């Protein structure tokens, strides 16, 4: 189970950004609309924060992810996810970490094309 949603959103965002003619309003707002979802897909369900050490359940396709410092702690989406419950499904999903880094660098670049 690889992070499908997150990679998809990454592709979307990345594309819009690298096809954006800096100055043009439409592409810009499209980016701004799309971006939080890509951010959301890389947010820890306990923190709200951006995954500081990604742990994904070897368990399920449910795609809920947490920081390493967020084991056994109370998740936020209520109702809680059924598949998530089992906590010893700790995997350091590399693809996730990479995507986290990707997103950070993407934001950096965006702010540059904004200023």
């Amino acid at each position: 189970m690889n992070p499908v949603n997150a990679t998809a959103l990454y592709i979307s965002a990345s594309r819009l950004v690298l096809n954006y003619d800096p100055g043009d309003p439409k592409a810009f707002t499209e980016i701004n609309r799309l971006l939080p979802y890509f951010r959301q897909s890389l947010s820890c369900c306990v923190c709200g924060h951006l995954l500081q050490d990604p742990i994904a359940p070897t368990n399920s396709t449910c795609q809920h992810y947490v920081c390493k410092t967020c084991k056994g702690k109370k998740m936020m989406m209520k109702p809680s996810c059924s598949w998530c419950k089992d906590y010893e499904q700790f995997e350091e999903n590399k693809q996730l970490s990479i995507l986290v880094n990707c997103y950070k660098k993407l934001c950096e670049y965006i702010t540059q094309t904004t200023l």
Binding site: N2, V4, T7, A8, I11, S14, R15, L18, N19
Partner: protein, 37 residues
């Protein structure tokens, strides 16, 4: 100047995305074959 360099890197980046995408697709086709058996 390093003007064109940026353009090149962008093109490469976009292509690499294309790859990542096709690769996701192929992971789908593989998981499909495995689940089929």
């Amino acid at each position: 100047g390093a003007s064109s360099q940026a353009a090149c890197l962008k093109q490469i980046l976009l292509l690499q995305l294309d790859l990542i995408e096709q690769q996701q697709q192929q992971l789908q086709a593989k998981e499909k074959e495995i689940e089929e058996l």
